[PDB]
Amino acid sequence: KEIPRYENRTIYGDIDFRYHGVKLHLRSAKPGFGLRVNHVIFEICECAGIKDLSGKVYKSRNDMNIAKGTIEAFTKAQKTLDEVALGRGKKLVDVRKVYYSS
Amino acid sequence: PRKANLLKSLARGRVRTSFNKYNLFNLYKKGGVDLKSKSLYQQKWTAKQETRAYHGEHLTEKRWQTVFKPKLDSVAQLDASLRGGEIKETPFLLQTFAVLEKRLDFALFRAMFASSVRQARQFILHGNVRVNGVKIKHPSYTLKPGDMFSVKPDKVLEALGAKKPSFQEALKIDKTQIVLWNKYVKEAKTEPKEVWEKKLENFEKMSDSNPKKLQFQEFLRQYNKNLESQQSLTFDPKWAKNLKYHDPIKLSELEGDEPKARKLINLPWQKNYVYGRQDPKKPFFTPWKPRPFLSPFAILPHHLEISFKTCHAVYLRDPVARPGQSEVISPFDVPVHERAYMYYLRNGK
Amino acid sequence: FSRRRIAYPFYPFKKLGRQHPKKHDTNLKTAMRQFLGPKNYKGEYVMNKYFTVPTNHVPNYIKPDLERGQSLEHPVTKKPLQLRYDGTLGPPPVENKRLQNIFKDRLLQPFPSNPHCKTNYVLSPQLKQSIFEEITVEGLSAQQVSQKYGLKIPRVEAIVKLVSVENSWNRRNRVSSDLKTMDETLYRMFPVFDSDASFKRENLSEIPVPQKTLASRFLTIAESEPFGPVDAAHVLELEPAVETLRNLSTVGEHSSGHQQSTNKNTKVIYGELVEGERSQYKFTNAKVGKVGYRYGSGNRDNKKDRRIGFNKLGQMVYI
RNA sequence: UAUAAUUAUUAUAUUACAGGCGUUACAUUGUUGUCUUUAGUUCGUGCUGCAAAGUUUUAGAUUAAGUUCAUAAACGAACA
RNA sequence: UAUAUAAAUAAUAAAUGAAAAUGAAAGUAUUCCACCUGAAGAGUACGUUAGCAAUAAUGAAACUCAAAACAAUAGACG
RNA sequence: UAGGUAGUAGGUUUAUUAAGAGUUAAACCUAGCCAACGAUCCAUAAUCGAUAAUGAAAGUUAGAACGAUCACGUUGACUCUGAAAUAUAGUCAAUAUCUAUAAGAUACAGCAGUGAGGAAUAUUGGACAAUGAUCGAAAGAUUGAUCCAGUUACUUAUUAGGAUGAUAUAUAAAUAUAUAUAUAUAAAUUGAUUAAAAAUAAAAUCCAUAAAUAAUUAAAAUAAUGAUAUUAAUUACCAUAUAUUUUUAUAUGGAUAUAUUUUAAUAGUCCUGACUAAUAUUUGUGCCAGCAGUCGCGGUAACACAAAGAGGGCG
Ligand SMILES: [Mg+2]
Ligand SMILES: [Mg+2]
Ligand SMILES: [Mg+2]
Ligand SMILES: [Mg+2]
Ligand SMILES: [Mg+2]
Ligand SMILES: [Mg+2]
Ligand SMILES: [Mg+2]
Ligand SMILES: [Mg+2]
Ligand SMILES: [Mg+2]
Ligand SMILES: [Mg+2]
Ligand SMILES: [Mg+2]
Ligand SMILES: [Mg+2]
Ligand SMILES: [Mg+2]
Ligand SMILES: [Mg+2]
Ligand SMILES: [Mg+2]
Ligand SMILES: [Mg+2]
Ligand SMILES: [Mg+2]
Ligand SMILES: [Mg+2]
Ligand SMILES: [Mg+2]
Ligand SMILES: [Mg+2]
Ligand SMILES: [Mg+2]
Ligand SMILES: [Mg+2]
Ligand SMILES: [Mg+2]
Ligand SMILES: [Mg+2]
Ligand SMILES: [Mg+2]
Ligand SMILES: [Mg+2]
Ligand SMILES: [Mg+2]
Ligand SMILES: [Mg+2]
Ligand SMILES: [Mg+2]
Ligand SMILES: [Mg+2]
Ligand SMILES: [Mg+2]
Ligand SMILES: [Mg+2]
Ligand SMILES: [Mg+2]
Ligand SMILES: [Mg+2]
Ligand SMILES: [Mg+2]
Ligand SMILES: [Mg+2]
Ligand SMILES: [Mg+2]
Ligand SMILES: [Mg+2]
Ligand SMILES: [Mg+2]
């Protein structure tokens, strides 16, 4: 599949998606934060290219369900900035990127 | 600190902040750090082993954990947009072991004043260093931007110079040197033609590698072809007779007396001074020469500026992490430091 | 799957087999012997290509991956040698193409497994002397020197201070031949810094990242609405990045627009000194509530974070 | 082979065991009886379920027979 | 006796769910009340209250253990 | 613990105090007051911080140590001084001990120390030199407050050696500068016959420092006063003159025949089936001896018991 990443580093915003019995609470991270997440999610991220993340798993902690849930969450739970702007008719600006611009 | 117990063991293969030949070979054969087929704890453990082996070997883990600072330092370039091209990712987590670089021990080692951080520690504790003109005996002294520190020049020459051979080692080396020189002259005198032609053949292929090219040219032009030419590196038979055999070395009477044994040695490349101990008063190999296996470890840090003319350095700033380059010098790739960083964040939980 | 693995070289090497019971050798030891080569009567491993030190301003770092572990070369011919069946050494049957062409980045990289570490450039003595003169003799600003030569302001200040030390050590005629040999040897060990070349020049547009700019923020505004760096500064409540770059350009000692006269408005009284007194007193005004030692403060003497400092003479003092 | 040498056997000893239809088919190899001339037992790729699994190996019929058709996530294959 | 609106029933989409399944809810939300925090001890002992009585309400702790429990799958068995 | 309260809730006056107030004493009324968001009663506890521990944080714990507040000085009540005492006063009551046998004295919750209790917590130490406190016009006197030292690894920090290092012999005609020195002899500890090591580990070599002895010897304190104290620190000859981040050199007078004292380095403890880092194998017992935080291991394959080799943490 294809996973959208914010600056090829982290997810867009926070995710609170539920897979069957697994409650995935994932939140974005600062540059250079590191993967401070459960080992299953850490492996999925390291293979998918995510470098900074933070989250906690609630209710069931079955490894396989966690892996399926996190892949799905990346795929559909999150939404890119461009898609939000287009469907909204508004402009979303990254303050960090525009502060360091020319 | 921790006692040096099997620092340079081959089986473990750990790389240390040292110029030692065994350490160099371990670095040579390490072939990266294996992290496949390991549970996340095992990967974290291997990373801590390797990083702690290199960075802060002498620091106790409790001290290191207290010193370890979660917040890392990085620099952002405004001119990135001016170039208008793809930018290299910033290696943020290569600055995990950057706190140790303020210490005077690491500062000396990076500045190529001591062969090892342990040697830097001993230099500091023995009163051979001065920070801003104040002599500091404590290795753990932390430095500030714009600071100066100096080391006694003799100590630096000892660190970066070859080991001084003992009396009997030098005497043996001289005896065998005379033995081989006598062979060279005898073979030159017996069949001068073949010796000269092979000497010229060696002269031809030199690849700007040794300084004997200009010596040999001066040798020839000193007495051969002062004004004549050939249509020059020409053969002469006089030098064969001019060569004189050197007297042998008893090695049993000359022992126990350096001045007496030193008057007999008259080698063309070593006159009136035994091998290595030209001036025994100095602690290093006199005349001074770089120590063996110095090339792979000679690195110029960016956070320090060094003047070997006077063994003075300036602490420009703390190491930083620019796009595509990290100022912390380490033989471990970014993932290893990532695993180590996430081990120490939770105290190894 | 974790197991203890002896750090055998990844590259192939001859492994000892049927051996005399009174040898007591190990595969690691023979690997080192193969890598180093013969040790002569002088204790020098001449064959190993890393025994010597480069004199051509190109660092000679380890390339185990590219040379497949063949570290032996003729000292003069500088051509590869490998062990044969007979136990002697000689040219390899084929030439290693990877060693033939090496990228400049790999040349400057000392450690094979870390491509983020590079060795800085040694500035020529002429460049240091020119910087010294321009700062002192010509009375220019270190900002100008940094801009022309591409160095940082801390670097140029370090250059001038070290050159002053060198001059002092020189007019005392203290520098011996050994130090000159050391400098000559190490000078040819690292590349020289060419101010003309752009890719050697160091970037001068570097800013420390404030904690707040590292935190992501997002605003939803009319698409037409233009958003610029200054608006980002307002919403992030930070000084504009260009302005911060300008500010740090003036913090240099010799840089333009520098002044440190802020602490010149405190009432300080020096007590009178009479004969025989071994000390003098300075009295500095300090407002009540802002001066003195707190009552009931924390006692970290017996804790892991105890404060340890140094005095003027350098003695370790429990601050 | 040229009275000798070598070899093979025999006899007498001894360390040394050999020997056992003694126990254990509830330790076994091999073989055999009954279910049994009974029609069952499994694998590769695909698909379904988060998964153990399932499918194929079946609605309905036919055959001595998962034999052969009809529909069907199934398409084939192996021991029968 | 075709057309529209309400209610019940039965089968479902989406959703929820550990699944079986629910499907004007066991879905999307809001408000209020009651109850649960491993098994065994135990709704037991003691106290109190009320009843003619059988009893009803309230209701512990000590000892022991890494158990205990639901849905569904594949066999074996009847 | 389901009802509690009876000066109890309130009103009016008088009395003491500087003062309001059923706070206390006296008189007359009203019939109230608390209570299932927990009264009354019972048990427990000294309380808190800009203090200590922990966590991402809200929080949770301790109340040792620094500081703040309260109560007590064997137990209970009362009284004079004062603005303030139910005072470590006194009286009285109670308890235990002692000698002087008396309306007698003491009560180590002041310092040091002793017996008991306990798994467990120190010297019957030096000085008022510094900061305070008391008396005195002052000189000064006292100060177990306080400052120091001793026991204790209870806690924290620093130090507790760097570089080099896999063998020793014998041979090598009798200064244009060479060089990949090359041959024979002997030995080679534990495990093993190669990815099975112990092991640069050891020995040996080069160079330092600690400690000792010599000189200076500040500063805590000045007018003088130093318990700590055999002070820390510096020089390894002392000091004067010159250049000068410091450092160092130049060179003069004081003692020697072209120097200027000596000099090293012996870590314990836990674990190696998984959670959990630790593959180099071998021996003993055989559901016994035993191990174990959880799963569990041991009845002849024990990676788990007891050990050797090797290894992994903390130090
Ligand atoms: Mg799991
Ligand atoms: Mg393991
Ligand atoms: Mg038998
Ligand atoms: Mg029989
Ligand atoms: Mg049978
Ligand atoms: Mg059988
Ligand atoms: Mg699936
Ligand atoms: Mg069937
Ligand atoms: Mg559905
Ligand atoms: Mg729900
Ligand atoms: Mg439910
Ligand atoms: Mg009942
Ligand atoms: Mg059990
Ligand atoms: Mg069931
Ligand atoms: Mg059946
Ligand atoms: Mg009144
Ligand atoms: Mg009253
Ligand atoms: Mg009354
Ligand atoms: Mg109550
Ligand atoms: Mg109490
Ligand atoms: Mg509290
Ligand atoms: Mg409390
Ligand atoms: Mg207290
Ligand atoms: Mg009292
Ligand atoms: Mg008492
Ligand atoms: Mg009282
Ligand atoms: Mg009394
Ligand atoms: Mg006492
Ligand atoms: Mg104790
Ligand atoms: Mg006093
Ligand atoms: Mg400690
Ligand atoms: Mg043996
Ligand atoms: Mg000393
Ligand atoms: Mg044990
Ligand atoms: Mg056994
Ligand atoms: Mg165990
Ligand atoms: Mg054992
Ligand atoms: Mg052992
Ligand atoms: Mg150990």
Tab-separated table of C-alpha atoms (C1' of nucleotides) in Angstrom, chain F residues 25-315:
chain	number	residue	atom	x	y	z
F	25	A	C1'	-20.710	33.049	86.533
F	26	A	C1'	-26.119	34.739	87.629
F	27	A	C1'	-31.500	35.789	86.134
F	28	C	C1'	-35.900	35.706	82.404
F	29	C	C1'	-37.728	34.196	77.796
F	30	U	C1'	-38.369	32.013	72.979
F	31	A	C1'	-37.848	26.052	70.775
F	32	G	C1'	-34.645	25.720	68.407
F	33	C	C1'	-29.628	23.790	66.214
F	34	C	C1'	-26.512	19.399	63.506
F	35	A	C1'	-27.921	15.113	60.412
F	36	A	C1'	-27.632	9.852	54.415
F	37	C	C1'	-23.184	15.479	49.913
F	38	G	C1'	-22.653	11.292	56.601
F	39	A	C1'	-24.440	14.025	62.492
F	40	U	C1'	-23.004	12.113	67.319
F	41	C	C1'	-19.515	8.206	68.467
F	42	C	C1'	-15.120	5.134	67.870
F	43	A	C1'	-10.059	4.160	66.085
F	44	U	C1'	-5.562	6.363	63.830
F	45	A	C1'	-2.159	10.290	62.995
F	46	A	C1'	1.874	15.747	64.872
F	47	U	C1'	0.727	19.404	60.153
F	48	C	C1'	3.010	21.756	55.807
F	49	G	C1'	6.789	23.981	51.704
F	50	A	C1'	9.647	27.411	47.066
F	51	U	C1'	11.628	19.818	51.027
F	52	A	C1'	12.798	14.373	49.306
F	53	A	C1'	10.999	10.016	45.820
F	54	U	C1'	8.364	8.855	41.571
F	55	G	C1'	5.437	9.863	36.658
F	56	A	C1'	4.770	12.522	30.199
F	57	A	C1'	1.314	14.710	33.345
F	58	A	C1'	-3.172	15.247	36.681
F	59	G	C1'	-1.463	12.923	40.763
F	60	U	C1'	0.659	9.293	44.669
F	61	U	C1'	4.088	8.535	48.953
F	62	A	C1'	7.444	10.306	53.103
F	63	G	C1'	7.324	14.241	56.742
F	64	A	C1'	14.558	11.325	57.785
F	65	A	C1'	17.519	15.794	56.172
F	66	C	C1'	16.815	22.149	55.235
F	67	G	C1'	12.947	25.554	56.678
F	68	A	C1'	7.763	26.961	58.833
F	69	U	C1'	3.781	25.906	62.579
F	70	C	C1'	1.729	23.258	66.904
F	71	A	C1'	2.124	20.349	71.557
F	72	C	C1'	5.302	18.374	75.484
F	73	G	C1'	9.973	18.299	78.811
F	74	U	C1'	7.895	11.405	84.371
F	75	U	C1'	1.566	12.274	84.926
F	76	G	C1'	-2.808	15.654	86.541
F	77	A	C1'	-4.773	20.205	88.668
F	78	C	C1'	-4.099	25.091	90.754
F	79	U	C1'	-1.308	29.999	92.039
F	80	C	C1'	2.249	34.951	92.186
F	81	U	C1'	5.257	38.077	88.585
F	82	G	C1'	3.933	39.812	83.380
F	83	A	C1'	1.402	42.160	77.974
F	84	A	C1'	1.834	37.054	77.520
F	85	A	C1'	2.891	30.809	81.857
F	86	U	C1'	-2.053	26.576	84.024
F	87	A	C1'	6.079	28.026	83.033
F	88	U	C1'	11.268	22.346	82.360
F	89	A	C1'	8.808	28.154	88.081
F	90	G	C1'	6.056	27.018	92.524
F	91	U	C1'	1.929	24.401	95.163
F	92	C	C1'	-0.667	20.071	95.231
F	93	A	C1'	-1.652	15.105	93.525
F	94	A	C1'	0.878	10.535	91.298
F	95	U	C1'	5.348	7.171	90.195
F	96	A	C1'	10.417	5.503	90.659
F	97	U	C1'	15.329	6.161	92.675
F	98	C	C1'	18.964	8.383	96.310
F	99	U	C1'	20.712	10.291	101.170
F	100	A	C1'	20.831	14.331	104.515
F	101	U	C1'	15.373	11.618	107.324
F	102	A	C1'	13.780	16.366	105.935
F	103	A	C1'	6.599	20.219	103.959
F	104	G	C1'	14.521	16.575	101.533
F	105	A	C1'	16.425	15.908	96.461
F	106	U	C1'	16.241	13.843	91.253
F	107	A	C1'	13.197	12.342	86.973
F	108	C	C1'	19.408	12.278	80.572
F	109	A	C1'	12.308	14.144	75.055
F	110	G	C1'	20.450	19.342	76.361
F	111	C	C1'	25.783	16.821	74.975
F	112	A	C1'	28.702	12.391	75.663
F	113	G	C1'	27.484	7.658	77.621
F	114	U	C1'	24.861	2.791	80.071
F	115	G	C1'	20.899	-1.284	80.500
F	116	A	C1'	16.663	-3.036	77.928
F	117	G	C1'	13.621	-3.195	73.101
F	118	G	C1'	15.137	-4.116	68.016
F	119	A	C1'	16.982	-6.370	61.799
F	120	A	C1'	19.090	-1.263	62.844
F	121	U	C1'	21.583	4.015	63.915
F	122	A	C1'	27.900	7.059	66.633
F	123	U	C1'	32.709	9.743	71.100
F	124	U	C1'	31.492	9.122	78.464
F	125	G	C1'	36.363	13.773	71.991
F	126	G	C1'	39.031	19.401	71.013
F	127	A	C1'	37.960	24.941	71.221
F	128	C	C1'	35.250	29.242	72.273
F	129	A	C1'	39.645	30.405	66.738
F	130	A	C1'	34.936	32.133	63.545
F	131	U	C1'	28.779	33.402	64.023
F	132	G	C1'	25.654	34.174	67.746
F	133	A	C1'	23.574	34.348	73.121
F	134	U	C1'	24.171	35.981	78.651
F	135	C	C1'	26.667	39.241	82.550
F	136	G	C1'	29.614	43.371	83.067
F	137	A	C1'	31.111	51.009	82.430
F	138	A	C1'	35.269	48.351	80.811
F	139	A	C1'	39.030	44.772	81.389
F	140	G	C1'	36.946	40.427	80.468
F	141	A	C1'	33.846	35.585	82.377
F	142	U	C1'	30.433	31.494	80.680
F	143	U	C1'	28.403	29.036	76.536
F	144	G	C1'	27.747	19.964	75.029
F	145	A	C1'	24.399	26.896	71.282
F	146	U	C1'	28.109	26.689	67.524
F	147	C	C1'	32.732	25.406	64.842
F	148	C	C1'	35.684	21.146	64.287
F	149	A	C1'	37.478	16.184	64.748
F	150	G	C1'	36.234	10.344	65.855
F	151	U	C1'	32.576	5.522	64.509
F	152	U	C1'	29.625	4.078	60.320
F	153	A	C1'	30.318	2.588	52.497
F	154	C	C1'	23.833	5.205	55.154
F	155	U	C1'	24.094	8.628	50.569
F	156	U	C1'	26.707	11.605	46.607
F	157	A	C1'	31.188	12.974	43.959
F	158	U	C1'	36.567	12.313	42.488
F	159	U	C1'	40.578	9.101	42.066
F	160	A	C1'	42.227	4.152	42.186
F	161	G	C1'	48.323	3.955	34.895
F	162	G	C1'	48.895	5.380	29.885
F	163	A	C1'	51.675	3.914	25.151
F	164	U	C1'	53.782	-0.650	23.300
F	165	G	C1'	53.176	-5.808	23.519
F	166	A	C1'	52.447	-12.920	20.758
F	167	U	C1'	58.891	-16.438	21.271
F	168	A	C1'	64.210	-17.061	21.997
F	169	U	C1'	68.640	-18.461	19.706
F	170	A	C1'	72.909	-18.981	15.723
F	171	U	C1'	74.419	-17.730	10.473
F	172	A	C1'	75.648	-14.549	7.333
F	173	A	C1'	83.371	-10.608	2.738
F	174	A	C1'	87.159	-10.130	6.325
F	175	U	C1'	81.174	6.368	2.892
F	176	A	C1'	75.897	8.532	-4.285
F	177	U	C1'	71.201	6.876	1.531
F	178	A	C1'	70.179	0.216	1.337
F	179	U	C1'	65.623	-1.875	2.744
F	180	A	C1'	59.553	-6.321	1.429
F	181	U	C1'	66.216	-9.073	4.915
F	182	A	C1'	66.522	-14.322	4.254
F	183	U	C1'	67.747	-18.962	6.318
F	184	A	C1'	68.226	-23.206	9.976
F	185	U	C1'	67.742	-24.896	15.760
F	186	A	C1'	64.678	-25.269	20.088
F	187	A	C1'	60.351	-24.513	23.007
F	188	A	C1'	55.326	-23.312	23.127
F	189	U	C1'	50.307	-23.354	29.657
F	190	U	C1'	44.271	-24.834	29.892
F	191	G	C1'	40.137	-26.709	26.073
F	192	A	C1'	39.877	-28.220	20.728
F	193	U	C1'	41.407	-29.900	15.573
F	194	U	C1'	39.036	-24.852	13.084
F	195	A	C1'	35.016	-20.303	12.421
F	196	A	C1'	36.760	-23.083	19.797
F	197	A	C1'	38.715	-20.421	22.245
F	198	A	C1'	41.207	-18.601	27.226
F	199	A	C1'	44.432	-14.406	24.844
F	200	U	C1'	47.043	-8.134	24.328
F	201	A	C1'	45.198	-11.354	28.370
F	202	A	C1'	50.327	-12.375	30.746
F	203	A	C1'	55.569	-11.432	30.678
F	204	A	C1'	58.825	-7.712	28.806
F	205	U	C1'	59.895	-2.320	27.042
F	206	C	C1'	59.081	3.341	27.021
F	207	C	C1'	57.050	7.379	29.862
F	208	A	C1'	54.481	9.466	34.008
F	209	U	C1'	52.080	10.209	38.950
F	210	A	C1'	50.579	8.871	43.963
F	211	A	C1'	53.176	8.081	48.741
F	212	A	C1'	57.645	9.292	51.393
F	213	U	C1'	61.711	13.351	52.635
F	214	A	C1'	63.329	19.035	51.733
F	215	A	C1'	61.671	24.536	51.058
F	216	U	C1'	57.663	28.154	50.736
F	217	U	C1'	53.219	27.710	53.220
F	218	A	C1'	48.532	31.174	52.252
F	219	A	C1'	42.965	31.436	54.016
F	220	A	C1'	39.083	30.620	57.399
F	221	A	C1'	40.767	36.809	61.572
F	222	U	C1'	42.200	40.474	62.446
F	223	A	C1'	44.754	45.480	66.159
F	224	A	C1'	45.802	40.334	68.622
F	225	U	C1'	43.544	35.692	69.295
F	226	G	C1'	43.556	29.084	64.696
F	227	A	C1'	40.412	23.672	67.942
F	228	U	C1'	40.391	21.933	62.932
F	229	A	C1'	46.374	21.151	62.140
F	230	U	C1'	51.696	17.119	61.118
F	231	U	C1'	46.205	22.587	57.315
F	232	A	C1'	45.123	22.914	51.845
F	233	A	C1'	48.263	24.238	47.801
F	234	U	C1'	53.086	24.987	44.948
F	235	U	C1'	58.215	23.917	43.865
F	236	A	C1'	61.482	18.613	43.490
F	237	C	C1'	66.960	23.410	44.803
F	238	C	C1'	65.933	29.049	47.072
F	239	A	C1'	65.564	33.999	45.568
F	240	U	C1'	66.863	38.733	42.669
F	241	A	C1'	67.203	41.145	37.091
F	242	U	C1'	64.909	40.711	31.586
F	243	A	C1'	60.891	39.158	27.303
F	244	U	C1'	55.927	37.342	28.289
F	245	U	C1'	47.393	35.094	28.775
F	246	U	C1'	49.332	31.488	32.157
F	247	U	C1'	53.439	28.338	30.860
F	248	U	C1'	58.600	28.913	29.778
F	249	A	C1'	63.441	30.670	28.600
F	250	U	C1'	67.639	34.058	29.279
F	251	A	C1'	71.216	34.391	33.954
F	252	U	C1'	72.767	35.920	38.430
F	253	G	C1'	74.361	35.182	44.280
F	254	G	C1'	73.688	31.029	48.181
F	255	A	C1'	76.109	24.053	49.035
F	256	U	C1'	78.636	19.709	45.594
F	257	A	C1'	81.628	17.132	41.711
F	258	U	C1'	80.148	19.082	32.558
F	259	A	C1'	73.887	17.129	37.498
F	260	U	C1'	70.595	19.053	40.424
F	261	U	C1'	66.125	12.812	45.848
F	262	U	C1'	63.446	8.197	45.170
F	263	U	C1'	59.251	5.694	43.185
F	264	A	C1'	55.235	1.505	42.429
F	265	A	C1'	50.021	-0.099	41.399
F	266	U	C1'	46.341	-7.507	42.635
F	267	A	C1'	37.761	-5.796	42.846
F	268	G	C1'	34.035	-7.872	44.385
F	269	U	C1'	29.288	-9.598	43.469
F	270	C	C1'	24.885	-11.728	40.526
F	271	C	C1'	23.529	-14.361	36.347
F	272	U	C1'	23.952	-17.462	31.156
F	273	G	C1'	15.915	-22.209	29.183
F	274	A	C1'	12.115	-17.921	28.109
F	275	C	C1'	10.312	-13.085	30.072
F	276	U	C1'	16.306	-11.150	30.019
F	277	A	C1'	22.370	-9.444	27.783
F	278	A	C1'	25.221	-13.932	28.090
F	279	U	C1'	26.703	-21.180	22.305
F	280	A	C1'	32.993	-23.419	23.516
F	281	U	C1'	32.095	-27.455	25.657
F	282	U	C1'	32.627	-31.271	29.998
F	283	U	C1'	31.730	-33.834	34.748
F	284	G	C1'	28.591	-35.521	39.397
F	285	U	C1'	23.200	-36.958	41.172
F	286	G	C1'	18.941	-39.384	38.588
F	287	C	C1'	11.360	-37.085	40.972
F	288	C	C1'	16.995	-37.851	45.524
F	289	A	C1'	20.051	-33.698	46.580
F	290	G	C1'	17.996	-29.581	45.297
F	291	C	C1'	16.638	-24.441	42.248
F	292	A	C1'	12.567	-20.967	41.548
F	293	G	C1'	9.968	-13.437	40.755
F	294	U	C1'	6.250	-16.188	36.633
F	295	C	C1'	6.198	-20.216	33.300
F	296	G	C1'	8.551	-24.224	35.447
F	297	C	C1'	13.729	-27.814	35.723
F	298	G	C1'	15.369	-32.844	38.284
F	299	G	C1'	12.248	-40.210	37.270
F	300	U	C1'	19.725	-41.319	32.406
F	301	A	C1'	19.921	-35.531	26.742
F	302	A	C1'	19.321	-31.537	33.306
F	303	C	C1'	21.273	-25.213	28.323
F	304	A	C1'	17.424	-24.652	34.767
F	305	C	C1'	20.284	-28.881	40.717
F	306	A	C1'	26.151	-29.049	42.293
F	307	A	C1'	30.659	-27.858	39.633
F	308	A	C1'	35.055	-26.814	35.613
F	309	G	C1'	35.917	-23.979	30.968
F	310	A	C1'	33.824	-19.810	28.376
F	311	G	C1'	30.571	-15.615	28.591
F	312	G	C1'	27.059	-11.420	30.079
F	313	G	C1'	25.564	-7.088	33.717
F	314	C	C1'	26.657	-3.539	38.031
F	315	G	C1'	31.097	-1.984	40.242
